[PDB]
Symmetry: none
Subunit: 28 residues, 10 copies
């Protein structure tokens, strides 16, 4: 029913690849 | 029914590739 | 029903690859 | 019903690969 | 019902691979 | 320079009040 | 420079009040 | 420079009040 | 520079009050 | 520079108050 292929070539990663990230940084 | 192929070539990544990101940064 | 193939080639990783990250950094 | 294949080649890892991380860093 | 294969090749690991980590670092 | 006054009366709360929430719920 | 006053009256709380929450719930 | 006053009256708390919470719940 | 006053009245607490919590609940 | 006053009145506590908690509950 559902098929997904992921092929990634990374040299230098400082961020997010195939990832889920949550950051707050709130102020009261 | 559903087919998806992803091929990515990255040299230097400082952001998001195939990713989901949430940031708050709110102020009260 | 559901099939997913992941192939990743990383040289130097300072961030997230196939990961889920949560950070607070809130201030009261 | 559900099948997932993960193949990762890492050279130097300073972050997260196939991982879940939680950080607080909150201030009162 | 559910099948998952993980194959990882790491050279030098300073972070997390297939791991779950919790850090507090809070301040009152 | 900046002044804010918040006064809230809640009977029953199942959601968010003066809060910041992040949810992923992504699928690969 | 910045002044904030918070006054909250809660009867029954099942959610968040003056809080910051992060949830993943991702699937690979 | 920065002043904040918090006054909270809670009857029964099953969630979060003035708190920061992180949950993973990821699946591979 | 920074001043914060917290006054909380709780009857019955089953969750978090002025707290920081991390939970994994991940599955491989 | 930084001043914080905490005054808490608790009747019955089953959770966390001014605390930091880490739980794994992971499965492989």
């Amino acid at each position: 029913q559902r098929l997904a292929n992921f092929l990634v070539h990374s040299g230098n990663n400082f961020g997010a690849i195939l990832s889920s990230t949550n950051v707050g940084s709130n102020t009261y």
